[PDB]
Amino acid sequence: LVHVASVEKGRSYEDFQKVYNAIALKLREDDEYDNYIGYGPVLVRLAWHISGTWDKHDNTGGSYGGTYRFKKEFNDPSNAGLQNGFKFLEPIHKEFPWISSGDLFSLGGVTAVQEMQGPKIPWRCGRVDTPEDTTPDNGRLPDADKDAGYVRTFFQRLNMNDREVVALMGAHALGKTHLKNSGYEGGGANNVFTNEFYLNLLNEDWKLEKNDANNEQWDSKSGYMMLPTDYSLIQDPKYLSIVKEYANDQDKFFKDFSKAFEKLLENGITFPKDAPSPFIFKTLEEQGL
Ligand code: HEM
Ligand SMILES: N=C(N)c1ccncc1
Secondary structure (H helix, E strand, O other), X not given: OOEEOOOOOOOOHHHHHHHHXXXXXXXXXXXXXXXXXXXXXXXXXXXXXXXXOOEOOOOEOOOOOOHHHOHHHHOOHHHOOOHHHHHHHHHHHHHOOOOOHHHHXXXXXXXXXXXXXXXXXXXXXXXXXXXXXXXXXXXXXXXXXXXXXXXXXXXXXXXXXXXXXXXXXXXXXXXXXXXXXXXXXXXXXXXXXXOHHHHHHHHOOEEEEEOOOOOEEEEEOOOOEEOHHHHHHHHOHHXXXXXXXXXXXXXXXXXXXXXXXXXXXXXXXXXXXXOOOOEOOOOHHHHOO
């Protein structure tokens, strides 16, 4: 199954920078969402969920087709809460109806990471909306109540290795869980992209507790939390080495995250030899906007 990237007709870097800027200005404007976290973290989660349905074995799922817009995927229990990100992006899509759904959802993630002071994430256009019957079934996204072996095996389906996995999970520096979405009680939350997830793992005094949904999670007296799958990164000796690496080298984490996140967003997509090079968007701050 082959999905060839096809650039939205006549569009170039400047067009996509305008879309980035619109997303970024709305991120700045709608600052009260989720107890003043803003929509940054949920847009990153959205980009990950629309991409994380991919299966390397048959090239089903993935970001290309924009299939999150269809009821089956929209209503996946694993996607509970992402409706907020979708609604956030609706007026952006109305202003720029020429952008494909997959391009918009993925660009939303890139914009959010960068605007939250994360690394630059090169981004490529050309995802094309596919029909409703191409929507992957529910159940392709990972469970949080599992161990390191589960995480490792799960991510093999997305063609991600140990480093890639550990880097990607660093996104859990952003935002929080919500008991009503996922059955996990949210802890201390930030909207700035840093390597603090790894520092938290290594430095806090974690206690295994049960939350009000009767699920186990790791909580600190400082008020932080970790999912069981988060904590598995320090239970497994291979993951632990990498956690320590990123806790001790901000720049290395940023570079590795950028590569892994672009890869995640591009899984399943064949880029023609004469496709445009990846775009690196300027932040609002860099533009003086
Ligand atoms: C084993 C893999 C993963 C599991 C089990 C997992 C699980 C979860 C859960 C349960 C939540 C809470 C959702 C809610 O209650 O609203 C969450 C939130 C989040 N996830 Fe993950 N996740 C995983 C990997 C990732 C990856 C790879 C990324 C991106 C690179 C990511 C980005 C985020 C972000 C940014 C949030 C915060 C959303 C918000 O604040 O609304 N996650 N994750
Ligand atoms: N470990 C966390 N604090 C976390 C943050 C956001 N999403 C999931 C987990």
